[PDB]
From a paper:
Here we report on the galactomannan degradation machinery of the common human gut bacterium Bacteroides ovatus, with a focus on the extracellular, cell attached β-mannanase BoMan26B for which we here solve the crystal structure. As for other GH26 β-mannanases with determined structures, BoMan26B has a (β/α)8-barrel fold with an additional N-terminal α-helix and the two catalytic residues (predicted acid/base Glu-201 and nucleophile Glu-291 (50)) located in a cleft. Extracellular BoMan26B initially cleaves galactomannan into shorter oligosaccharides, which are transported into the periplasm by the SusC-like transporter.
To investigate the structural basis for the galactose side-group tolerance of BoMan26B, and the biochemical differences observed with BoMan26A, two crystal structures of BoMan26B were obtained: an apoenzyme structure and a structure containing the saccharide 63-α-d-galactosyl-mannotetraose (G1M4) in the active-site cleft. The two structures are very similar, 297 Cα atoms align with 0.148 Å root mean square deviation (RMSD), using PyMOL. A weak electron density was seen in the −1 and +1 subsites of the apoenzyme structure, but no molecule from expression, purification, or crystallization could be modeled with confidence. A calcium ion was modeled with 0.5 occupancy in the apoenzyme structure coordinated by Ser-108, Leu-105, and Glu-179 and three water molecules with a binding geometry typically seen for calcium. The calcium-binding site is not located in the active-site cleft and thus does not have a glycan-binding role. BoMan26B contains a potential calcium-binding site and was 100% stable over 24 h at 37 °C in the presence of 1 mm calcium, but it lost about 40% activity when it was not included. Trp-112 is situated in loop 2 that is also involved in the calcium-binding site. Thus, the calcium-binding site may play an important role in the correct conformation of the −5 subsite. A surface view of BoMan26A and BoMan26B reveals a more open active-site cleft in BoMan26B, with five subsites on the glycone side, whereas the BoMan26A cleft is narrower and restricted by loops 2 and 8, resulting in only two glycone-binding subsites. The longer and more open active-site cleft in BoMan26B correlates with its preference for longer substrates and production of a range of oligosaccharide products.
Numbering used by the authors: 37 to 361
Write the structure that this text describes.
């Protein structure tokens, strides 16, 4: 059943909690699919709260985004304030994080973006020791490693998914496979130097992009991000292709929106390790606003989520075992 999936994380001496989380996911492979929601933008669990108000159940995994490194610390975003992550973990939920790596729109700008169409930041220069771009990404990694170390010191592991969708060539890190792989290894080695042993590394594949794969030494789980795909058969075809490319690794639907209901996906063979719905900015940015209660959602509405939780294979937060002690 799951004998092909690797038993060990790529990180030597990974934390007890990271190993427990990974081992649980490995045990679920082919049998269960975890539910997950994205934060509203970055640093909250507003979509998890929204899902509970629609269904009575919470998602198993809450994901956060370190996108706003340039502004942190600020009145409105401070990644040193880890209570929102701590509180989720202590309520028994799993913690995930991604990272829209925002860089100056142009040299000396005060605007920060991540799409190639919105920044001229050049990864090839960022990898050359001593350049302006290199100093920028080193300082970002130092700041980010410090924020992640706050979670490590609280014994909170993170299902960590940086540098995603590289081969789509729409983010500044998607210029070319060779420089992309060098950047992934720099992030990994920088974090290793900082002592971050609480991370499970998720590499997001666009399918048929093996030239972009950073390597077994730097990756634990494969992710796929899919929007606007309502053929469950097509979703299963993607799932199968990823399983074939990476037969030793769990495969997750790490982002989705406007996709076939989970019952159809599962019946077609798309047996993802988890699915994470993207956020609807206007609906969940304010949990006190009337729109919070309506049930409509750009990515997965009330009916979609009640369908998902109606399926035997789908895990909610209260289904999870304990990952602490
Ligand atoms: Ca900062
Ligand atoms: Cl629950």
């Amino acid at each position: 059943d799951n004998s092909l999936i690797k038993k060990e994380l790529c990180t030597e001496g990974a934390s007890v909690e990271a190993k427990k989380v990974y081992t649980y996911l490995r045990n679920c492979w082919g049998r269960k699919t975890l539910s997950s929601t994205m934060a509203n933008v970055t640093w909250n669990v507003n979509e998890a709260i929204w899902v509970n108000r629609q269904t009575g159940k919470y998602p198993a995994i809450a994901c956060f985004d370190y996108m706003n490194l340039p502004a942190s610390p600020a009145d409105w975003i401070d990644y040193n304030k880890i209570s929102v992550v701590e509180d989720w973990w202590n309520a028994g939920g799993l913690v995930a994080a991604c990272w829209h790596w925002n860089v100056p729109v142009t040299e000396n700008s005060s605007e920060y973006k991540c799409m190639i169409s919105e920044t001229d930041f050049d990864i090839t220069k960022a990898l050359q020791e001593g350049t302006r771009e290199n100093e920028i990404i080193k300082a970002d990694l130092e700041e980010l490693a410090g924020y992640l170390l706050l979670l490590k010191q609280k014994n909170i592991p993170v299902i960590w998914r940086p540098l995603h969708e590289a081969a789509g060539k729409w983010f500044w890190w998607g210029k070319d496979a060779a420089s992309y792989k060098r950047l992934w290894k720099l992030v990994y080695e920088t974090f290793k130097q900082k002592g971050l042993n609480n991370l499970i590394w998720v590499w997001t594949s666009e399918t048929n992009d093996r030239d972009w794969y950073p390597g077994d030494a730097y990756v634990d789980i494969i992710g796929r991000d899919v929007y606007h795909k309502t053929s469950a058969a097509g979703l299963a075809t993607d799932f199968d292709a990823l399983k074939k490319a990476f037969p030793d690794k769990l495969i997750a639907l790490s982002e989705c929106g406007d996709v076939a209901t989970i019952d159809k996906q599962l019946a077609a063979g798309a047996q993802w390790a988890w699915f994470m719905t993207w956020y609807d900015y206007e609906v969940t940015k304010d949990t006190t606003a009337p729109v919070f209660n309506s049930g409509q959602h750009e990515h997965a509405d009330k009916a979609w989520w009640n369908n998902a939780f109606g399926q035997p294979g789908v895990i909610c937060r209260s289904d999870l075992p304990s990952f602490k002690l």
